[PDB]
C-alpha cells in the first residue's frame, strides 16, 4: 500500500491517539452487531445476545485488542502487508473459512469507529488515507485466496 508522505503522517498522527485497549473492541463489537452473521465465528465468546451484551463482552474486548494490534503491525510495514499477514491469512482463510468480503467490512467498521471517536478531525482526506490502509489489510488477509 502506497500512501503519500503527508498521508502517512496524517494516518500515524491519528493512530497514535487511538486507545489501544478499547478501539479494537469497539470495531469487532460493531462488526458483530452490524453484520450479525459474523457472530457465528465467535460462539465460544459467550453472551452476544444484544448489542449491549456484545459491546461489554470481555472476550470481544480482549480479542479486539489483538485485531487492533494487527492493524498497527500493518501500519508499521505498509510495504510488506502480505508477509505481515501471511500467518493470519492462513488462519482465517484455510482454517476458519471466513469469507473475504467480511475483511472489507471490518475495515470499514473500524473507519466508522475512528470517525465516531474523532469527530471533525476525521476529515475526508484523512479518511481517504485510512481507506488505502484498510483495503491493503483486507487484501493481505485474503491473500491465501488469490
Amino acid at each position: 500500500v502506497h500512501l503519500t508522505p503527508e498521508e502517512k503522517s496524517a494516518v500515524t498522527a491519528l493512530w497514535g491517539k487511538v486507545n489501544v485497549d478499547e478501539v479494537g473492541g469497539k470495531a469487532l463489537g460493531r462488526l458483530l452487531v452490524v453484520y450479525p452473521w459474523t457472530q457465528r465465528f465467535f460462539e465460544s465468546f459467550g453472551d452476544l445476545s444484544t448489542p449491549d451484551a456484545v459491546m461489554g463482552n470481555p472476550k470481544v474486548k480482549a480479542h479486539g485488542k489483538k485485531v487492533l494490534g494487527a492493524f498497527s503491525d500493518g501500519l508499521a510495514h505498509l510495504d510488506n502487508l502480505k508477509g505481515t499477514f501471511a500467518t493470519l491469512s492462513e488462519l482465517h482463510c484455510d482454517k476458519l473459512h471466513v469469507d473475504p468480503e467480511n475483511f472489507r467490512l471490518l475495515g470499514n467498521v473500524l473507519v466508522c469507529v475512528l470517525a465516531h471517536h474523532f469527530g471533525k478531525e476525521f476529515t475526508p482526506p484523512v479518511q481517504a488515507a485510512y481507506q488505502k490502509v484498510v483495503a491493503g489489510v483486507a487484501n493481505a488477509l485474503a491473500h491465501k485466496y488469490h
Partner: peptide, 10 residues
C-alpha cells in the same frame, strides 16, 4: 437462517 444459524450471505 438469520437468528439461529447465522448464515453468511455469501
Amino acid at each position: 437462517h438469520a437468528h439461529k444459524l447465522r448464515v453468511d450471505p455469501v
